[PDB]
């Protein structure tokens, strides 16, 4: 681990992007994560909220 | 706008509600602002026969 600093900068950047991309799958309380299902199986008034 | 409907369909004149009079012959938007006034009148509308 002589090059710890350079390796660490690279790993932090990669991990940041990974978490940002992965968090799209989370639902945050909505009934589903994909937009299409929300707009398919529900009327517009409930799809808004 | 004035018209006459059945008894159990007064609920369908509302923003975003699907039914048989709302999706086929009278439809008001989802951003509607204003209001509705319905008063049962079968003293002038139902005849014997």
From Swiss-Prot, chain A:
Biological role stated in the UniProt entry: Subunit of the fusion protein that is processed upon entry into the host cell. Mediates fusion of the virion and cellular membranes by functioning as a class I viral fusion protein. Contains a viral fusion peptide that is unmasked after S2 cleavage. This cleavage can occur at the cell membrane by host TMPRSS2 or during endocytosis by host CSTL. In either case, this triggers an extensive and irreversible conformational change that leads to fusion of the viral envelope with the cellular cytoplasmic membrane, releasing viral genomic RNA into the host cell cytoplasm.
Effect of residue 39 to F: In strain: Omicron/BA.1
Organism, as annotated: Severe acute respiratory syndrome coronavirus 2
Source organism superkingdom: Viruses
Name of the molecule in the record: Spike protein S2'
Coiled coil segments of this chain: 7-49
Residues of the full protein shown: 943 to 991 of 1273
Gene name linked to the record: S
Listed result of changing residue 40 to A: In strain: Alpha/B.1.1.7
Swiss-Prot record, chain B:
Effect of residue 47 to T: In strain: Omicron/BQ.1.1
Region called Integrin-binding motif, residue ranges: 6-8
Subunit structure and binding partners: Binds to host ACE2. RBD also interacts with the N-linked glycan on 'Asn-90' of ACE2. Cleavage of S generates a polybasic C-terminal sequence on S1 that binds to host Neuropilin-1 (NRP1) and Neuropilin-2 (NRP2) receptors. Interacts with host integrin alpha-5/beta-1 (ITGA5:ITGB1) and with ACE2 in complex with integrin alpha-5/beta-1 (ITGA5:ITGB1). May interact via cytoplasmic c-terminus with M protein. May interact (via N-terminus) with host bilirubin and biliverdin, thereby preventing antibody binding to the SARS-CoV-2 spike NTD via an allosteric mechanism.
Function according to Swiss-Prot or TrEMBL: Attaches the virion to the cell membrane by interacting with host receptor, initiating the infection. The major receptor is host ACE2. When S2/S2' has been cleaved, binding to the receptor triggers direct fusion at the cell membrane. When S2/S2' has not been cleaved, binding to the receptor results in internalization of the virus by endocytosis using host TFRC and GRM2 and leading to fusion of the virion membrane with the host endosomal membrane. Alternatively, may use NRP1/NRP2 and integrin as entry receptors.
Protein name: Spike protein S1
Lineage, top ranks: Viruses, Riboviria, Orthornavirae, Pisuviricota, Pisoniviricetes
Included stretch of the parent chain: 398 to 446 of 1273
């Amino acid at each position: 681990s002589a090059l710890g600093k350079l390796q660490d900068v690279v790993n932090h950047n990669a991990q940041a992007l990974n978490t940002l991309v992965k968090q799209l799958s989370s639902k945050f309380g909505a009934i589903s994560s994909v937009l299409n299902d929300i707009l398919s199986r529900l009327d517009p008034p409930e799809a808004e909220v | 706008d004035s018209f006459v409907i059945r008894g159990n369909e007064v609920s369908q004149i509302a923003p975003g509600q699907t039914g048989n009079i709302a999706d086929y012959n009278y439809k008001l938007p989802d951003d509607f602002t204003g209001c509705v006034i319905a008063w049962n009148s079968n003293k002038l509308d139902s005849k014997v026969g």
